[PDB]
Design an enzyme around this catalytic site. Structure first.
Site, PDB file in Angstrom:
ATOM      1  CD  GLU A 213      40.272  41.965  83.450  1.00 29.39           C
ATOM      2  OE1 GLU A 213      41.007  41.233  82.969  1.00 29.39           O
ATOM      3  OE2 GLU A 213      40.542  43.202  83.562  1.00 29.39           O
TER       4      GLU A 213
ATOM      5  CG  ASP B  10      48.497  40.437  81.656  1.00 32.05           C
ATOM      6  OD1 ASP B  10      49.522  40.618  81.169  1.00 32.05           O
ATOM      7  OD2 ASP B  10      48.007  41.016  82.847  1.00 32.05           O
TER       8      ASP B  10
END
Ligand code: CL
Ligand code: CL
Ligand code: XE
Ligand code: XE
Ligand code: XE
Length: 162
Positions: A11, A20
């Site tokens: 991440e 994202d």
């Protein structure tokens, strides 16, 4: 290696609001803020999550705090799901970490839908599960990440992460 380091690798860590791989506002260690295109809505969800007016920026500690909450929630989501829990309890520690990563990424419902892979994992048919898991949008959209998680379920080792 453990779940935390594993997800910190997949991440990354970003202290300012970002988008994202799907274009949704997120912050920290993959903490999704909102699916809404509105940055203000994202700033509002962030302030509510932190408990202060952040102006779209947080510190490292705050990020790690949201991360701890999110890992915890992910585990709890699996334990609470009748389709997930039995699979999860049947796995060894390494493989469990892989199941957590997936849930953290796509949600419990999302993972609860990999019916066929779920069953192969429960039966410990590793290579078969691996092939079935790759036949997914998840794999075609984030293939590098999906390969690492897949190998982890395949092998039961942290090799893909070293
Ligand atoms: Cl929250
Ligand atoms: Cl990826
Ligand atoms: Xe699982
Ligand atoms: Xe899983
Ligand atoms: Xe899965």
């Amino acid at each position: 290696m453990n779940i935390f380091e594993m997800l910190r690798i997949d991440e990354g860590l970003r202290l300012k609001i970002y988008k994202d791989t799907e274009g949704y506002y997120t912050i920290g260690i993959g903490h999704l803020l909102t699916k809404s295109p509105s940055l203000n809505a994202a700033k509002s969800e962030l302030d509510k999550a932190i408990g202060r007016n952040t102006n779209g920026v947080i510190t490292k500690d705050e990020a790690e705090k949201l991360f701890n909450q999110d890992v915890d929630a992910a585990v709890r989501g699996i334990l609470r799901n009748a389709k997930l829990k039995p699979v999860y309890d049947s796995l060894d520690a390494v493989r469990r970490a892989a199941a957590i990563n997936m849930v953290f990424q796509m949600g419990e419902t999302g993972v609860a839908g990999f019916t066929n892979s779920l069953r192969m994992l429960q039966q410990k048919r590793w290579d078969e599960a691996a092939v079935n898991l790759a036949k997914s949008r998840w794999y075609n959209q984030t293939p590098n990440r999906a390969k690492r998680v897949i190998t982890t379920f395949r092998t039961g080792t942290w090799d893909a992460y070293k």
